[PDB]
Every structure is written in structure tokens, then in C-alpha cells.
Amino acid sequence: VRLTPTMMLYSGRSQDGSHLLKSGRYLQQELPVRIAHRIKGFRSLPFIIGCNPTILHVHELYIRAFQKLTDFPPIKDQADEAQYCQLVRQLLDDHKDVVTLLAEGLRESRKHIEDEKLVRYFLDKTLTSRLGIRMLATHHLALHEDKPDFVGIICTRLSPKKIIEKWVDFARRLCEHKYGNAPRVRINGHVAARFPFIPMPLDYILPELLKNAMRATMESHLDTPYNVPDVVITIANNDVDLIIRISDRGGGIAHKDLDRVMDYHFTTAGFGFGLPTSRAYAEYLGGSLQLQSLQGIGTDVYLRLRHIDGREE
Numbered sequence: 001v002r003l004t005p006t007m008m009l010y011s012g013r014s015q016d017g018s019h020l021l022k023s024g025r026y027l028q029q030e031l032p033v034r035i036a037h038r039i040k041g042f043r044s045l046p047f048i049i050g051c052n053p054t055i056l057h058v059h060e061l062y063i064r065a066f067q068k069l070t071d072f073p074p075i076k077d078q079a080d081e082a083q084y085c086q087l088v089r090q091l092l093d094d095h096k097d098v099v100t101l102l103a104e105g106l107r108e109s110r111k112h113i114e115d116e117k118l119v120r121y122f123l124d125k126t127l128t129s130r131l132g133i134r135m136l137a138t139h140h141l142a143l144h145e146d147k148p149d150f151v152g153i154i155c156t157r158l159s160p161k162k163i164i165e166k167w168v169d170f171a172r173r174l175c176e177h178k179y180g181n182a183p184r185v186r187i188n189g190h191v192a193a194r195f196p197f198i199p200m201p202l203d204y205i206l207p208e209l210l211k212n213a214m215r216a217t218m219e220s221h222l223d224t225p226y227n228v229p230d231v232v233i234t235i236a237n238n239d240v241d242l243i244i245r246i247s248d249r250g251g252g253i254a255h256k257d258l259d260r261v262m263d264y265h266f267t268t269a270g271f272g273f274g275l276p277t278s279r280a281y282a283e284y285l286g287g288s289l290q291l292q293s294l295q296g297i298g299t300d301v302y303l304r305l306r307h308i309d310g311r312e313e
């Protein structure tokens, strides 16, 4: 039963299906509290901003969620838990565009309020807590299915190389679609490591970073699109954390942009959420995301995620 931070993912002791109820009760008496926290966040948001239409729309969904959830009777038996899963599925789907919506509604309205680092704390705080929720929720639902090397959304023997490769193809295509080509990606270091880990966070961060790296390479090699420098990913696996370094030769982050690439909405393009979102996720989970810019050569991005709750290897 691994946690992070005030949340916990249960290791299912199957049989009677008892865990299903233990987990469901937990989930059922967690989501609401947390949703409530988000409602306070909307309530304290600057008036000008909170007044924007889509910000209101999201604000409304959140209240609705709190209500539907609150109106759900306490889980007593399987049939309850089961219908709960139906509700959780629904909310999740209802809130699938929340991030886009926020990005949109907030883009204009933030250039109005007094405190600038204020919008950031809100986004940091809202997006992370959402990740936490969807994890907790997807995990519970997951405890119903039975995939191999998985207990909920917790993979028991995750391969960094494999998951890195999944998103490489994903991004390579996206890139190839836009430029007619994409950089090859070489992976080195602990390429055979396998350990318990939760792919979700990686499923959001890796593609964002690969996208950045690949776009950078192409926009900096407009004369030889058919031949661009490789992206090199290095996996470092130790007892404390998993470190994934993504090095490109795409010209780096200009000195003039360094202090901005981490701000929500900043972008030299694709609304500028990739980096600030990924950093929040990493830190939320107990890791970090750091940049090393070599202006004129390329960038090195270091993703660091902590291990389960043991010294994985």
C-alpha cells in the first residue's frame, strides 16, 4: 500500500472482494474533501478572473462534482461500490477538459490582477490536486480489472526504457507529421532496470518533454530537416530515485527566455503548459524537473521521480 503525499494506493488483498469496499470507502470519503478544497480555490481567485465565463464553467463542474459525490450514500456492499465506480467514471469524463478550459479562461484574465505569482500558485495547486485525484480514482477502478504486472495503476515491474519508448514513437509521429521528419532517440544508462512504479505521471511528463525536445531540434535545423541531431535519454536508477535525462541538440533555451519557460502560458510557439505542468507534477510526487541550457547547442532536461516507498532497482 504505497502513498504520496496524504493519499494512498491500496495493495488489493482480493478474495471476498473485501478490498474493493475498503478502497471504495476510502475513495468515497476523500474525493469530496479534496473537491471542497478546490472549491475554496475558486472562491478566493481574483474577482475579475473568477468572473470569466469558462472559469465559472469549471467552477460549476467542481461544485457539481462535490454534490454528486456528497449525495452518494455510504458504501455498504458491492452493489454500492459498483455503482460508485459508475459515478467516479462519469466525473472523470466530465472533467477531462478541465485543464484546457482553465488554460483558456485564464489566459486573458490573469493579465489583470495585482499578484502575478498568484495565478501560478493556483494553477500549481489545482492541477496537482487533480492529478492526485485522478490517480486515486483510476487506481480504485483499476483494482477491478486484472492486467499483468499491475495492482491497480501500480505496475509491479515497470521498464523505464519501455515506457520511454512508448512516448518516443508517439512524439516522433506527432513531429514527423509536422516537419516531414523527427529526430531519432537513443536511450542509455540503466536500460534494463525494472521496478515497481506508477506510469501515470510518466505518461504525462515524458510526452511533454519529448515534444519540447523534438520541436526544438526541428525549428533549429530548418535547412536539413531530413537530417537532424539525435535526442539522447539517459536512465539512472538508484535506491532513492529514478532519474531520466533528456538531452537535445536543438539550440538551447535563450537567455532571454530562461525565466519564463516555467511560467504557465509562456511559449515561443501549444499553450505553454508542458514545463510548468510537468514540474508541478514532479514536485507534487516528491521529485523535480530541472533544465540545463547550453545556448547555441541544446538543452538538457532532468526528470527526477522518487521510488515507490522502497529503494527500487
Ligand SMILES: Nc1ncnc2c1ncn2[C@@H]1O[C@H](COP(=O)(O)OP(=O)(O)OP(O)(O)=S)[C@@H](O)[C@H]1O
Residues within 6 Å of the ligand: 208, 212, 213, 216, 248, 250, 251, 252, 253, 257, 261, 262, 266, 267, 268, 269, 270, 271, 272, 273, 274, 275, 276, 298, 299
Ligand atoms: N528542449 C527545449 N529546447 C528549447 N526550447 C525549449 C525546450 N523545451 C521548452 N522550450 C521553450 O520553453 C517554452 C515553454 O514550453 P512548454 O511549457 O513545454 O510549452 P509549449 O511547448 O510552448 O506548449 P505546450 O506544452 O504544448 S502547451 C517553449 O515554448 C520553448 O520556447
Ligand SMILES: [Cl-]
Residues within 6 Å of the ligand: 034, 035, 037, 129, 132
Ligand atoms: Cl486535495
Ligand SMILES: [Cl-]
Residues within 6 Å of the ligand: 059
Ligand atoms: Cl457560483
Ligand SMILES: [Cl-]
Residues within 6 Å of the ligand: 070, 071, 072, 073, 074
Ligand atoms: Cl448520503
Ligand SMILES: [Cl-]
Residues within 6 Å of the ligand: 174, 175, 178, 211, 214, 215
Ligand atoms: Cl511536434
Ligand SMILES: [Cl-]
Residues within 6 Å of the ligand: 189, 190
Ligand atoms: Cl550502464
Ligand SMILES: [K+]
Residues within 6 Å of the ligand: 260, 261, 262, 263, 264, 265, 266, 267, 272, 273, 274, 275, 276
Ligand atoms: K511555459
Ligand SMILES: [Mg+2]
Residues within 6 Å of the ligand: 208, 209, 211, 212, 273, 274, 275
Ligand atoms: Mg511543451
